[PDB]
Amino acid sequence: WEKWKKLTNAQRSGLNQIPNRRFTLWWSPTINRANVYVGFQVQLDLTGIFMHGKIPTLKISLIQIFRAHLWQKIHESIVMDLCQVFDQELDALEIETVQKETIHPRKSYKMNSSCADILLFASYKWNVSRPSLLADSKDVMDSTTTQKYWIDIQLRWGDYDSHDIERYARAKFLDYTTDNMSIYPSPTGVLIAIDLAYNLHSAYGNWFPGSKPLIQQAMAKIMKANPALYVLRERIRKGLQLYSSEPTEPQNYGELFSNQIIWFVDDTNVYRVTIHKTFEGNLTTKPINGAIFIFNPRTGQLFLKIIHTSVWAGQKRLGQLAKWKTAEEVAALIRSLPVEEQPKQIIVTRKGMLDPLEVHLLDFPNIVIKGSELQLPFQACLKVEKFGDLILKATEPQMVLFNLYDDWLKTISSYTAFSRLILILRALHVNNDRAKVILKPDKTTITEPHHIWPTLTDEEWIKVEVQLKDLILADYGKKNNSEIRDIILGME
């Protein structure tokens, strides 16, 4: 926060309004909420912000942010970009023509009724589902057909009391489609809600084949890329006088740590054999216990489903029947799970094992399953002392749960704890020995018995981050005579 000439009387006195102005802009979704006592509602001038009073400090901040018709320019850029996406993918989607309605220059900031933005002309016919949320999957493109689609973009500026944009998009859709003033040139379309104060987005409407992934991707790219939005965000930052400190502006995991679950599964080492020779010259090996690794890094949670060789008796060949077990086991997992730890997308090391669990997971068919394009060193979780001996001497196949994020979620992110983890896992993967000596540098570094890793400080933590990554690079060089990020993280 923001570390001659001779002035007239009223310059050498009277307060400075600028720090008051920026305190109000910062605290502004609270100072300007919707649930008030007495207060008469009013629309900011050329936009769709509501005030419920007269707070001149706040009104001045907000007005000077949205100068020069920035609100409509935002509406116009967002509609153009959607158009262009359809300009391009006409082919796969059967779009014969794309119709951008020549704009009412006030459609963006009239808030109780709506023209439409995009008119979609099929080639032949679309069969179309019932409406659901842009975050809901199972869609039955059966109910009707048409050549006419409309698409709506509605911008709001939410506040502390009300910034859920799912229910916003739902209510605006239901209402605006069953009202008697909004002229929709079809009985079918979609509504896309942007929340400019919180940079949120979603949509509700009647869908057809392709629409869900198409929009999902186009929206997530606009919200990041669009140039109007960039001018918005930039007037906001400069009216706050906020600066970043990170250089470099700090792939899936920007999708992955989200409040929606994603699991990481390792079943490459559930079957292992330990080899020692006979008096006979033949090096005979004894099978040993294993473990399915299920990970949630937005939590630091492992389910360790240890496999017993109780199942090595009369099952013919190891690997594919092991695929089969892992499948039915994760199925039982989802069965036993409660309604706030239910998984949403699960990525396994074995891209060859998706199919058996694919089929087995139909009792819980909401599961986006995938094989991970970035392997993460849970195979290096065979190395540690607690987990290993646990598995090794267990007798009955079983479940355990660890929080690898020992105390970290108090003073780092799930982001940062996941990154640091990747460091540690790959460090056991690559050396295990320089790993021991790097992560226990001080002679009397300790671990609390419920920890996977010691009790450090931030100083040596940053030092050892650089150290472990130095090691990963050193060893890549030794055995081979964006890149650093992705080698740290996983596959390439």
Binding mask of the shown chain, residues 9 to 48, with x at each position contacting other proteins by CB under 8 A: -xx--xxxxx-----------------------xxxxx--
Site pattern 61..100 for other proteins (x: CB under 8 A): --xx--xxx--------------------------xx---
Contacting residue, 23, 26, 121, 184, with other proteins by CB under 8 A: 121
Please, which residue, 56 or 185, has the CB nearer to other proteins? 56
Nearer to other proteins (CB atom), residue 4 or residue 279: 4
From 85-93, 246-254, 410-418, 440-448, span contacting other proteins (CB under 8 A): 246-254
Tokens (6 digits) for 208:
């057809």
Nearer to other proteins, 69 or 100 (CB): 69
Cβ neighbours for 337, distance < 8 A, ≥ 6 positions apart: 343
Binding residue for other proteins, selected from 185, 187, 227, 441, defined by CB under 8 A: 227
The nearest distance, CB 5 to other proteins, in angstroms, is: 7
Q: Smallest gap, in angstroms, from Cβ of residue 147 to other proteins?
A: 8
Instruction: Give the nearest distance from C-beta 68 to other proteins in angstroms.
Output: 5
**Which contacts of 184-189 are long-range, i.e. CB under 8 A and separated by 24 or more positions?**
184/116, 184/150, 185/116, 185/119, 185/148, 185/150, 186/119, 186/146, 186/148, 186/149, 186/150, 187/144, 187/146, 188/128, 188/144, 188/146, 188/148, 188/149, 188/150, 189/116, 189/149, 189/150, 189/151, 189/152
Cα distance between the two ends of the chain: 39
For other proteins, the closer of residues 11 and 444 by Cβ is: 11
Which residues inside 388-407 make contact with other proteins, applying CB under 8 A?
Answer: none
| Residue whose C-alpha is closest to residue 163's, from 28, 41, 256, 20 | 28
Non-local (6+) Cβ contacts of 217 within 8 A are none
C-alpha torsion angle, residues 46, 52, 53, 59 (rounded to 10): -40
Q: How far is the CB of 10 from other proteins (least distance, A)?
A: 5
Interface size with other proteins, residues (CB under 8 A): 48
**Rounded CA separation 406/426 (Å):** 18
Pick the closer one to other proteins by CB: 52 or 386. Answer: 52
Quick one: angle between helices 17-31 and 227-240, nearest 10? 120
Structural tokens at position 341: 């730890």
Binding status of residue 8 toward other proteins by CB under 8 A: yes
Site string for other proteins, 315-334 (x = CB under 8 A): --------------------
Do 484 and 474 meet the contact criterion of CB atoms below 8 Å apart? no
Q: Is 116 helix (H, G, I), strand (E, B) or coil?
A: coil
Which residues contact other proteins (rule: CB under 8 A)? 3-5, 7-8, 10-11, 14-18, 42-46, 51, 56, 59-60, 63-64, 67-69, 96-97, 105-106, 121, 123-124, 225, 227, 230-231, 234-235, 237-238, 243-245, 247-249, 482
